[PDB]
Amino acid sequence: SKLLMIGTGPVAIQLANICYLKSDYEIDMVGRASTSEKSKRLYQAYKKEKQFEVKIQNEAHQHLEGKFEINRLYKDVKNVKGEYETVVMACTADAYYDTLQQLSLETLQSVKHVILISPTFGSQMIVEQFMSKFSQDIEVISFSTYLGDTRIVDKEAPNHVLTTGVKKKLYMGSTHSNSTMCQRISALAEQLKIQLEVVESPLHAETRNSSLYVHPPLFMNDFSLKAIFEGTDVPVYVYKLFPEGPITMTLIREMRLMWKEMMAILQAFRVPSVNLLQFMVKENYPVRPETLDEGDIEHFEILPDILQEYLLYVRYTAILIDPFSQPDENGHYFDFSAVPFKQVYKNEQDVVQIPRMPSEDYYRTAMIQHIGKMLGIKTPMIDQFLTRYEASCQAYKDMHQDQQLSSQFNTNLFEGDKALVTKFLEIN
Amino acid sequence: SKLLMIGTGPVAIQLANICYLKSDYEIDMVGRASTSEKSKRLYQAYKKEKQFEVKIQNEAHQHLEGKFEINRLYKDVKNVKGEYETVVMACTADAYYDTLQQLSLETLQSVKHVILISPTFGSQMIVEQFMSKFSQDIEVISFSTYLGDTRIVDKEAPNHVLTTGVKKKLYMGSTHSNSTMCQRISALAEQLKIQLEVVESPLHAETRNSSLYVHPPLFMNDFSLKAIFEGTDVPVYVYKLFPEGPITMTLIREMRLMWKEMMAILQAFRVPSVNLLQFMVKENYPVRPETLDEGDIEHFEILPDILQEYLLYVRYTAILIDPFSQPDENGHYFDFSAVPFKQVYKNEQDVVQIPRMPSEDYYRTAMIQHIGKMLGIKTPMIDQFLTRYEASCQAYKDMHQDQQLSSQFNTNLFEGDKALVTKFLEIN
């Protein structure tokens, strides 16, 4: 009956309000001032007010809103002590290992369940293999993604968060079949009015995330890496067609190729394949009936390569606008495509950061690449994605020797994650 | 050395300036005022000034400009008398026969050369067959299209026209291989710095018109016919993707099917095929190198069907903006796609007219269909375009019984054109 919520961003906060209203757990949250001025302004803002607050936009999501208090906000992970039955990981997948390994032996030995909110493909294997040393029967649970969209409206008041939207459907898998904890989560989902499909494994869950297939080709190409690391003459956009954005036949082919590389890996783990087009269209954002044939969507996975590409391309063109929005008196629709690229930026101690896209995609792809070496599956598209990213990093270093850079510019990152995966797959 | 120029619109004026400056002919032009308030305004304007004028927007086309007089402007076709060696048809292809048929016996028997400026596929067969009664060795010449863009900036001064642009390349074929006339038009085109490829037959030249293949799928579909005949709630656009415009995978398939139906017909005549994609991209409007692969463009005609469709689709997405225009400070380019549909409209005597798009396409496709039929080539996509244009026309009659309507709403038009085509192919 103690819960450790790792993270103090909007995800953590929304999830903590859920535990506060709907569970019997005492809640401890863990930030990291030692590393993060976001974390620090949050500690400070909670310290002052002694409340968190979730607001919502669409009154349909009432059941997620709340003002609430936590038992304890820890300032940094190293400060954690005592026993916790359940640990909720609400931070980036690339910090799972590095975070857990800073907990105390006692804390670690007490944990019965770790719950991964935004894991990548392989996260559970990493975490179950780490946590193994300390509990011979740890349960790990993976969700496919966070349940929605939650943001901070005032950077000045980060304890107050706004949940703008909730996913149509989530997936979840546990290292333990039908466990008590799975059922509690299911009944919890039922209560939140969020559809949740329970799948045979956490790895299966980790595959039901469209970003896994899409983000690497979208951000790990010359057009996108330029816009991120160097900048452009005029603004460009993530989802627009060249020259306004990177979307191109080449881009769509690299996406098909990455998606197929992944499906070879899913077959090796006997995890069912993902119909990426159906997923996109039926679970992410719809298109008009005129734009894509239902038959083509349904049978996507067995259609010719070129037609799979044609369909994906068409999908992205249909979404250049929101076709379901109200058009204006000139017949223009909401420019849904005009999402700018986040560029590399100096934090407040003049240290250069690489944004989440593509930092995190680097980690994702690095892990998939690694799993592939272990299984003897070639992944030449993935390799190429990693090479281009690594090349943009070295170029940044050579061209900005006078600047301080974060450790995201280093190599070879993720050794621990990779050793864990290697050990997990040697064992099974 | 008398030339009869049939037409008094901007095409006619620009071509008459060419003949005035560069030939030895005395020029008579023929309007049709007993029939046309545009043609009447032109007559009155030339009667007042006794000058026509071609102006140019861009000094690259100085060689086309000038002020000029002609020998005689006739008010109506039936008024024409006397002998003319050369007749230039500068009007719409659907009026060729109906216009020529109003000339006198003497005039007809005098003609040596008929030159077709904006013919459709089959126009030379109609014109050669008609003129055969009266001249045994009539020479007929077909261009691919008019040489450029010419308009009337100010409709109250229609004898003054502006040529805004000139095509990269035109084609031409004559019934008489390497004739004196062909050689003179070639020498003429070199002087005008217009590239002119001479091809083996008028039919060959008539097929090098990208509108033949493109316009029927763009305008003879339910989205576009609704916009033309009924109107829409918010403006829609000819070149935009659904729901902003008709463009859709379905539209592009229809375009490929029609093009292929055309190519079967061309094969029956041993006319080379048309690489639609290369034509659109090399001869019409360019795209950035990143958008389409050069090899895809070159080898289009042998690519599989689904690939052909994909590339055509991409082609149209690429041209949604002008990707060669200067983007603004938000990274937005000039909105090349935003061409409104012209709707059915009432003339000055309250008679409802169908605009050029798709009136003229109806004629074009109807001659194509007839020619297919006579050759036993199945043309199911063309049959369907025709069927829908006819349904839209009939629904309009039913839905607007109180309105006076042009003859464009009748069936079965083009009887005479078809009988001539039939007769021509009987003989060859």
Residue A56 and residue A16 share a domain: yes
Cα distances (angstroms) measured from residue A72 to each of A23, A44, A80, A265, B93: 16, 13, 10, 42, 84
Three-state SS sequence of A170-202:
EEEEECCCCCHHHHHHHHHHHHHCCEEEECCCH
Dihedral sign for Cα A44, A46, A48, A54, please. positive
Cβ contacts (< 8 Å) between B237 and chain A: which residues? 331
Give the integer Cα–Cα distance in Å for B234 and A199.
45
- CB of B244 within 8 A of CB of B236? yes
- CB of A340 within 8 A of CB of A357? no
Give the integer Cα–Cα distance in Å for B183 and B139.
13
CB atoms within 10 A of CB A181: 17
Q: Name residue A149's beta-bridge partners.
A: A165
Q: Do B291 and A237 touch (CB under 8 A)?
A: no
How many separate domains does chain A show?
2
Cα distances (angstroms) measured from residue A148 to each of A15, A170, A284, B247, B332: 11, 10, 12, 33, 31
Q: Do A330 and B288 touch (CB under 8 A)?
A: no
In one letter, which amino acid is B3? L
Residue B409 and residue B270 share a domain: yes
Residue B199 and residue B323 share a domain: no
- Sheet harboring A169-174: ordered strands across? A72-74, A26-30, A2-6, A86-89, A113-116, A139-143, A169-174, A195-198
Q: Do A250 and B290 touch (CB under 8 A)?
A: yes
3-state SS assignment for residue B249: helix
Give the integer Cα–Cα distance in Å for B246 and B218.
7
Domain-ending residue, one of B166, B189, B208: B208
Q: Provide the terminal-to-terminal Cα distance of chain B, rounded to the nearest Å.
A: 30
How far does the CA of residue A395 sit from the closest CA of chain B (Å)? 23
Task: Give the H or E element holding residue B10.
Answer: helix B10-22
Residue A53 and residue A135 share a domain: yes
Cβ contacts (< 8 Å) between A295 and chain B: which residues? none
Q: Which residues of B are known to be catalytic? A: 215
Give the integer Cα–Cα distance in Å for B214 and B314.
15
The verdict on A299 touching B (C-beta cutoff 8 Å) is: no
Q: How was this structure determined?
A: X-ray
Give the integer Cα–Cα distance in Å for B31 and B159.
12
Phi, psi of A237, deg, nearest 5: -135, 140
Q: Do A248 and B293 touch (CB under 8 A)?
A: no
Mutate to test the interface with B, among A226, A239, A248 (most CBs of B within 10 A): A248
Give the integer Cα–Cα distance in Å for A91 and A68.
20
How far does the CA of residue A176 sit from the closest CA of chain B (Å)? 46
Q: This structure's resolution (angstroms)?
A: 2.3
Q: Name residue A27's beta-bridge partners.
A: A3
Residue B108 and residue B35 share a domain: yes
Q: Do A244 and B331 touch (CB under 8 A)?
A: yes
Mutate to test the interface with B, among A250, A288, A313, A314 (most CBs of B within 10 A): A314
Give the integer Cα–Cα distance in Å for B405 and B398.
12
The verdict on B339 touching A (C-beta cutoff 8 Å) is: no
Residue A369 and residue A254 share a domain: yes
**How do B52-56 and B66-68 pair as beta strands?**
antiparallel
Could you tell me which of A272, A269, A400, A261 has the C-alpha nearest to residue A344?
Answer: A400
Give the integer Cα–Cα distance in Å for B229 and B393.
8
Phi, psi of A39, deg, nearest 5: -40, -45
Helices A356-375 and A222-229: angle between axes, nearest 10 degrees: 140
Could you tell me which of A422, A420, A425 has the C-alpha nearest to residue A133?
Answer: A420
User: What b-and-e string marks burial along B272-282, b requiring 16 or more CB atoms within 10 Å of the CB?
Assistant: eebbbbbbbbe
In one letter, which amino acid is A329? E
Give the integer Cα–Cα distance in Å for B127 and B417.
9
Closest residue in B to A330 (Cα) is: B235
Residue A74 and residue A16 share a domain: yes
Domain-ending residue, one of B187, B208, B229: B208
Structural domain containing residue B303: 209-428
- CB of A147 within 8 A of CB of A167? yes
Give the integer Cα–Cα distance in Å for B120 and B428.
18
- CB of B30 within 8 A of CB of B4? yes
For B124, counting Cβ atoms within 10 Å of its Cβ (0-12 exposed, 13-18 middle, 19+ buried), the class is: buried
Residue B213 and residue B156 share a domain: no
How far does the CA of residue A407 sit from the closest CA of chain B (Å)? 32
| Tokens describing residue A204 | 């299966």
Residue B153 and residue B55 share a domain: yes
Residue A189 and residue A98 share a domain: yes
Q: What is the DSSP string of A10-54?
A: HHHHHHHHHHHHH---EEEEE-BTTT-HHHHHHHHHHHHH--EEE
Domain-ending residue, one of B176, B208, B240: B208
Q: Which residues of A are known to be catalytic? A: 215
Q: Do B321 and A244 touch (CB under 8 A)?
A: yes
Residue A234 and residue A161 share a domain: no
Residue A303 and residue A243 share a domain: yes
- CB of A170 within 8 A of CB of A283? no
